[model samples]
Target: YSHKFTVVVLRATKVTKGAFGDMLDTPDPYVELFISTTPDSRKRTRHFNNDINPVWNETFEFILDPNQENVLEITLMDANYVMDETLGTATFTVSSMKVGEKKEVPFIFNQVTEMVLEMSLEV
Candidate 1:
């Protein structure tokens, strides 16, 4: 019932500016990965400073239960000041995912911004 999965953070495009309107550049951006089956195994990527379209190219691995309702959560955020701003969240069901296949999922943030995540699963 347990399966291994590999996920790539890929990139975030058309991100909303985290700073004020008068600001010159956007806030630093990063990504967080989580699995419902393994809550304590969350992973975070390094911040890509001031880039609206940030490319992570980061990969993460997790053990998931295919028989149960498993969800893979992806969080996009802006690392500004001491607190970070949540850009968007994307969730995928592991039961619906196919092994050895790669796919891209798109998520919208604050109605206007969009982020893309790529993933592949293996048995």
Candidate 2:
């Protein structure tokens, strides 16, 4: 039963600086992660208020099928009242990890914007 993979979203280095093309103020940032599965596959994190480097210890798990194409998708967004701006979009192949092993990987985005996640494939 090593098809169950757990993901822990740690934090981001910078968000406002990634979208520095716009005249900005204190920005609220959040993350959305998902895989192609049934319902409830999409997971989202709590948005931080006025934080460029938001800390989120959010955990999400995905049960996979060996025959299926298991690709992980992550999106970083700024939570705004008008429109939530996109910071980064990263896709990772989950099939590369060894069963029952854990790895710390960074989802690098624009400029200095990066988010790290601790992942483990378990039974």
Candidate 3:
């Protein structure tokens, strides 16, 4: 028999200051992260800042639903200088895990699914 439930966790890192600029030599600046989730398979969802301060080393937990069996599309946007800009995202399939089982997932460096801004700034 299949388990009745499962748990998923996420640990996210804050966007660095240099990520706001397209150059590496530029000094780091405080950039904010915006996130959004959409279940639609036809089009992508827009991410917003929600007008809140960004924090580092933030973790989140999710409970899998028994009826939902699909990939969860999460989009993270960098809005330190601008809003609704694509930064990255984490796309994971909602697989079946036995009840009371906990899973830990780490987002890869390049595979973290974020889009850096190409806007150039004076170093």
Candidate 4:
């Protein structure tokens, strides 16, 4: 029950300043994607500073085993100088996805930010 997923980290929009939590400056946001059970099999995107609305357009390949309640998790983080801080997270359900069909999906984080990803499943 293993499938290969091609995921494209498209972009983030409607990111609020309050998402950063009392911060004066804007955040440099990037995203992380991984299977819930396979944390080490992670993929990341580059970031832009002073950008509330960020675009990545980075692509990644994941070997997904849709087992139990495990779904793909995505973490949106602020690229800090000392250490990166997590902004919010959203899980993506891929079990319903059809093989060989590309789908555009949106993940809403804390109802404050939304990130889009284009993904396709293959055997």
The per-residue C-alpha lDDT of model 4 at residue 45 equals 74
Better of 1 and 4 by lDDT: 1
* Candidate 2 clash figure, as a count: 0
lDDT of 4 by residue, 3-54 (tens): 6767787888766545453364677776777666554666677675567788
TM-score of each: 0.81, 0.80, 0.39, 0.76
| Model 1: lDDT to the true structure | 0.73
Displacement of the residue 44 alpha carbon in candidate 3, Å? 15
Q: Using TM-score as the measure, what is the rank order of every candidate, best first?
A: 1, 2, 4, 3
Which lDDT value does model 1 have at 60? Answer: 77
Give the lDDT of residue 16 in candidate 1.
77
RMSD of each: 2.6, 2.8, 12.0, 3.0
Question: What is the Cα-based lDDT of residue 49 in candidate 2?
Answer: 51
Residue 27's lDDT within candidate 2 is: 65
Compose the digit string of candidate 1's lDDT tens values, residues 38-117.
Answer: 64657788676577777887777776667766788778877666566776778888767667887787777777677777
Candidate 2 lDDT at 102 equals 73
Kindly report which residue pairs in candidate 3 clash with one another.
Answer: 87-114, 87-115, 88-113, 88-114, 89-113
